[PDB]
Design an enzyme around this catalytic site. Structure first.
Site, PDB file in Angstrom:
ATOM      1  CG  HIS A 150       2.151  16.177   5.827  1.00 23.98           C
ATOM      2  ND1 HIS A 150       1.816  15.212   6.743  1.00 23.98           N
ATOM      3  CD2 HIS A 150       3.483  16.372   5.954  1.00 23.98           C
ATOM      4  CE1 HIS A 150       2.911  14.845   7.398  1.00 23.98           C
ATOM      5  NE2 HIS A 150       3.932  15.548   6.949  1.00 23.98           N
ATOM      6  CG  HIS A 175       6.068  14.186   2.465  1.00 25.61           C
ATOM      7  ND1 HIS A 175       6.556  13.028   1.871  1.00 25.61           N
ATOM      8  CD2 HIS A 175       6.067  13.953   3.802  1.00 25.61           C
ATOM      9  CE1 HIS A 175       6.847  12.143   2.809  1.00 25.61           C
ATOM     10  NE2 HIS A 175       6.533  12.672   4.003  1.00 25.61           N
ATOM     11  CD  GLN A 205       0.070   1.209   6.139  1.00 23.09           C
ATOM     12  OE1 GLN A 205      -0.472   1.881   7.012  1.00 23.09           O
ATOM     13  NE2 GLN A 205       1.231   1.555   5.596  1.00 23.09           N
ATOM     14  CG  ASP A 239       6.154  13.662  10.122  1.00 24.83           C
ATOM     15  OD1 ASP A 239       5.504  14.307   9.271  1.00 24.83           O
ATOM     16  OD2 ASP A 239       7.224  13.128   9.902  1.00 24.83           O
ATOM     17  CG  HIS A 261       7.050  18.910   9.464  1.00 21.79           C
ATOM     18  ND1 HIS A 261       5.712  19.118   9.406  1.00 21.79           N
ATOM     19  CD2 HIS A 261       7.263  17.668   8.990  1.00 21.79           C
ATOM     20  CE1 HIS A 261       5.123  18.050   8.901  1.00 21.79           C
ATOM     21  NE2 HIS A 261       6.038  17.143   8.653  1.00 21.79           N
ATOM     22  CG  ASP A 262       7.645  17.221   5.517  1.00 22.97           C
ATOM     23  OD1 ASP A 262       8.850  16.916   5.623  1.00 22.97           O
ATOM     24  OD2 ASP A 262       6.684  16.446   5.831  1.00 22.97           O
TER      25      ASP A 262
HETATM   26  C1  LIG Z   1       3.909  -3.179  -0.285  1.00 19.95           C
HETATM   27  C2  LIG Z   1       4.747  -3.290   0.969  1.00 19.95           C
HETATM   28  C3  LIG Z   1       5.518  -4.424   1.223  1.00 19.95           C
HETATM   29  C4  LIG Z   1       6.314  -4.540   2.361  1.00 19.95           C
HETATM   30  C5  LIG Z   1       7.141  -5.779   2.607  1.00 19.95           C
HETATM   31  C6  LIG Z   1       6.336  -3.480   3.254  1.00 19.95           C
HETATM   32  C7  LIG Z   1       5.534  -2.362   3.057  1.00 19.95           C
HETATM   33  C8  LIG Z   1       5.604  -1.208   3.962  1.00 19.95           C
HETATM   34  N1  LIG Z   1       4.743  -0.194   3.943  1.00 19.95           N
HETATM   35  C9  LIG Z   1       5.242   0.715   4.866  1.00 19.95           C
HETATM   36  C10 LIG Z   1       4.737   1.940   5.280  1.00 19.95           C
HETATM   37  C11 LIG Z   1       5.455   2.663   6.233  1.00 19.95           C
HETATM   38  N2  LIG Z   1       4.990   3.920   6.685  1.00 19.95           N
HETATM   39  C12 LIG Z   1       3.748   4.475   6.585  1.00 19.95           C
HETATM   40  O1  LIG Z   1       2.774   3.918   6.083  1.00 19.95           O
HETATM   41  C13 LIG Z   1       3.630   5.841   7.131  1.00 19.95           C
HETATM   42  C14 LIG Z   1       4.588   6.864   7.344  1.00 19.95           C
HETATM   43 CL1  LIG Z   1       6.301   6.832   7.040  1.00 19.95          CL
HETATM   44  C15 LIG Z   1       3.797   7.927   7.885  1.00 19.95           C
HETATM   45  N3  LIG Z   1       2.517   7.597   8.002  1.00 19.95           N
HETATM   46  N4  LIG Z   1       2.430   6.313   7.547  1.00 19.95           N
HETATM   47  C16 LIG Z   1       1.128   5.655   7.530  1.00 19.95           C
HETATM   48  C17 LIG Z   1       6.662   2.166   6.752  1.00 19.95           C
HETATM   49  C18 LIG Z   1       7.151   0.933   6.359  1.00 19.95           C
HETATM   50  C19 LIG Z   1       6.428   0.224   5.414  1.00 19.95           C
HETATM   51  N5  LIG Z   1       6.650  -0.990   4.800  1.00 19.95           N
HETATM   52  C20 LIG Z   1       4.771  -2.265   1.898  1.00 19.95           C
HETATM   53 MG   LIG Z   2       9.683  15.137   6.276  1.00 23.54          MG
HETATM   54 ZN   LIG Z   3       6.009  15.260   7.573  1.00 21.86          ZN
END
Ligand SMILES: Cc1cc(C)cc(-c2nc3cc(NC(=O)c4c(Cl)cnn4C)ccc3[nH]2)c1
Ligand SMILES: [Mg+2]
Ligand SMILES: [Zn+2]
Length: 314
Positions: free
Chosen positions: A71, A67, A268, A216, A105-106
């Site tokens: 970004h 952030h 992911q 975002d 925005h951040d």
């Molecule tokens: C190790 C582990 C275990 C379990 C059970 C879940 C996750 C998990 N990883 C997650 C990433 C995001 N969000 C992003 O990657 C994101 C955002 Cl926010 C913006 N751009 N990106 C790419 C949201 C929810 C997520 N749950 C990870």
């Molecule tokens: Mg933000």
């Molecule tokens: Zn952002």
């Protein structure tokens, strides 16, 4: 007049939705002015106040893994691409406001979620009980606008200035991912009942909100190497937060626990299905030329699956 110009490769590829702004910090302000001069016009802002404003904004972003200043310009670039491919649909004030909303925005992000500020009992959580950080980001944007020689909107009428500030405020608040789920649901029904009306100001608000979510999260819409490398920076922050949750005596959620490092590809996959794909799908339906965002989102989904099945490493 003085036209900002980019090297040949940057000049061509900046028009692609998957452009990466590269590793030279000193070029990002130049890239952002170029995008403003071509999407708004060279007469939108006094060049000297824009430059003073850009550098004050940069100075109020922090040295955090994700952030950060890079970004900010990246999200602004995604908005540039959306605006250029849908140029007949937006007002003079919306062009002016949205690249600036994206840059700001951040502002002053410390790498912690709204939830950690609540469990910590940070003073911002007493000041702003929902969208805590996002309300702080906006407040930081106004501070900067009110610095001497920094009012880039000095030529606007009193009422126009109030409108453009209201565009910026709403677009920034919309980056609170907690509000995205509601906003996209509303937009999906409105699309699929034929009620959606771009002349309706509270509908415009919802569409711009979705454009901000799309911008975002745009790391999921880059070439795979950018997407994969950018995911290290995200989890770097998430895991520092989870460490801090542990220090409060609280079990962090899974994505913030560095012990669950091996579950990232599955996390992911979960994020792409529940959030990204729906986001870019609804945005493609409403703004058909944004197609390449969803296409590249699917390509990267397909890549996370290769990683789960051991045909790719990370
Ligand atoms: C190790 C582990 C275990 C379990 C059970 C879940 C996750 C998990 N990883 C997650 C990433 C995001 N969000 C992003 O990657 C994101 C955002 Cl926010 C913006 N751009 N990106 C790419 C949201 C929810 C997520 N749950 C990870
Ligand atoms: Mg933000
Ligand atoms: Zn952002």
């Amino acid at each position: 007049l003085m036209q900002f110009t980019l090297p040949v490769r940057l000049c061509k590829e900046i028009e692609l939705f998957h452009f990466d702004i590269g590793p030279f910090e000193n070029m990002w302000p130049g890239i952002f002015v170029y995008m403003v001069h071509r999407s708004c016009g060279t007469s939108c802002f006094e060049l000297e106040k824009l430059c003073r404003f850009i550098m004050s904004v940069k100075k109020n972003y922090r040295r955090v893994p994700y952030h950060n200043w890079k970004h900010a310009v990246t999200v602004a670039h995604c908005m540039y691409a959306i605006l250029q491919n849908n140029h007949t649909l937006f007002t003079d004030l919306e062009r002016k406001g949205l690249l600036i909303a994206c840059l700001c925005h951040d502002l002053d992000h410390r790498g912690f979620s709204n939830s950690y500020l609540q469990k910590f009992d940070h003073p911002l959580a007493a000041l702003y009980s929902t969208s805590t950080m996002e309300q702080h980001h906006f407040s930081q944007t106004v501070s900067i606008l009110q610095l001497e020689g920094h009012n880039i909107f000095s030529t606007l009428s009193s009422s126009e200035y109030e409108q453009v500030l209201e565009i910026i405020r709403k677009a920034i608040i919309a980056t609170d991912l907690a509000l995205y789920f509601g906003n996209r649901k509303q937009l999906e029904e409105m699309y699929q009942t034929g009620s959606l009306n771009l002349n309706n100001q509270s509908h415009r608000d919802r569409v711009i909100g979705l454009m901000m979510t799309a911008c975002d999260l745009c790391s999921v819409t880059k070439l795979w190497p950018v997407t994969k490398l950018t995911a290290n920076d995200i989890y770097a922050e998430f895991w520092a937060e989870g460490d801090e949750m542990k220090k409060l005596g609280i079990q962090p959620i899974p994505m913030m626990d560095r012990d669950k490092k091996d579950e990232v590809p599955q996390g992911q996959l979960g994020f792409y299905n529940a959030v990204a794909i729906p986001c870019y799908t609804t945005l493609t339906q409403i703004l058909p030329p944004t197609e390449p965002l969803l296409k590249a989102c699917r390509d990267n989904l397909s890549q996370w699956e290769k990683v789960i099945r051991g045909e790719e490493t990370a």
